[PDB]
């Protein structure tokens, strides 16, 4: 009879529009579990993220809201497409679960890291990552959790970014929610952050692509810092000074390191043959790596500069790189506390609006 229907995927219940068929488990976001599904109406694959009673909690609801809002107003060939949203429940009283339907790409960057890209591929993917991010930043939003498994690709070589649960405007204001290996120093050492925090992640991702493996492995949150300084060498005192005093002592106590040069961090053996024409050169790649992977945020290149960098700008196209920002309904400000119930209503209105 009715509009929705239910499938058990292992221990989890997906109740969804009958259009959505053949769910298969595929993943998780910061919040949420995700299935792939056939949309019998549009006749294509999709991805359905279930968020379970997101209002359960300050955290869960904050993130859920953001992700709802951002998924809506964002508009770029390099961000993942919204397709649908719903809830099977029929009233604010009933209300408990949310579902978000998205384009399904083919794979995440996992996946690419082990294969051997030519420069044109490597550079092109980065170029796309950056356009994506310049889109978000252009409206003042920071992804915060860029990382291979949040970047997806398709076999025609296109690429999009994913998961906005952690996305928000500039920092200060909890630590351990960004994935360990991609934590910028500002994030590791608790100093709060600006948009180029995302740049650090891009650098790690790029490094991983070339390296074949995680750039700064890091066996726990504190060891993370060792891996960074072991490779890049010890930050300057100018930098130390910005640390809070408790963290400053630990840091200044670390064994000093010269660090390797990018030439030694990333030697030619690692790269493919250099390009037919000019700028797609290992050394140019090194040069970009060296302006992204920089401990001191205030000395770190921005996306705009990264788009202008010779290794990247060979694809530069203003209609991709300089598109209008997403418009965020100025209500949503990614910070304010609310209540058990205030949230419950916010999300619901928000799903309602969006249904």
């Amino acid at each position: 009879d009715n509009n929705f229907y239910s499938v058990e995927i292992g221990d989890s219940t997906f109740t969804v529009l009958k259009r959505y068929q053949n769910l298969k488990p595929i993943g998780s976001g910061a919040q949420g579990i995700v299935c792939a599904a056939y949309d019998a109406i549009l006749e294509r694959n999709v991805a359905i993220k279930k968020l379970s009673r997101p209002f359960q909690n300050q955290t869960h609801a904050k993130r859920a809201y953001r992700e709802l809002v951002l998924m809506k107003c964002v508009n770029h060939k390099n961000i993942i497409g919204l397709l649908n949203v719903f809830t099977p429940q029929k009233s604010l009283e009933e209300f408990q679960d949310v579902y978000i339907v998205m384009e399904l790409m083919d794979a995440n960057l996992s996946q690419v890291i082990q294969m051997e890209l030519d420069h044109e591929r490597m550079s092109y993917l980065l170029y796309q990552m950056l356009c994506g991010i310049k889109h978000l930043h252009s409206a003042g939003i920071i992804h915060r959790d860029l990382k291979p498994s949040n970047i997806v690709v398709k076999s025609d070589a296109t690429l999009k970014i994913l998961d906005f649960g952690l996305a928000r405007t500039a920092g200060t204001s909890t630590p351990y929610v960004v994935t360990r290996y991609y934590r910028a120093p500002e994030v590791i050492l608790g100093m709060g952050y600006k948009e180029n925090v995302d740049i650090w992640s891009v650098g790690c991702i790029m490094g991983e692509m070339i390296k074949g493996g995680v750039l700064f492995p890091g066996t726990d949150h504190i060891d993370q810092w060792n891996k960074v300084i072991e490779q890049l060498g010890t930050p300057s005192p100018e930098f130390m000074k910005k640390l809070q005093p408790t963290v400053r002592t630990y840091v200044e106590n670390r064994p000093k390191y010269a660090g390797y040069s990018f030439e030694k961090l990333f030697p030619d053996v690692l790269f493919p043959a250099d390009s037919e024409h000019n700028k797609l050169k290992a050394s140019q790649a090194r040069d970009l790596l060296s302006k992204m992977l920089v401990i001191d945020a205030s000395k770190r290149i921005s996306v705009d500069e990264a788009l202008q960098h010779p290794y990247i700008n060979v694809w530069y196209d203003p209609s991709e790189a300089e598109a209008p920002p997403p418009k965020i309904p100025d209500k949503q400000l990614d910070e304010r506390e609310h209540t058990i119930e205030e949230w419950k209503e916010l999300i619901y209105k928000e799903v309602m609006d969006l249904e």
Binding site: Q111, V112, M115, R121, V153, A157, H277, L280, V314, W315
Partner: peptide, 10 residues
């Protein structure tokens, strides 16, 4: 310099 239009994900 042409954009690639393929990516081998097999």
């Amino acid at each position: 310099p042409k954009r690639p239009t393929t990516l081998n994900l097999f």
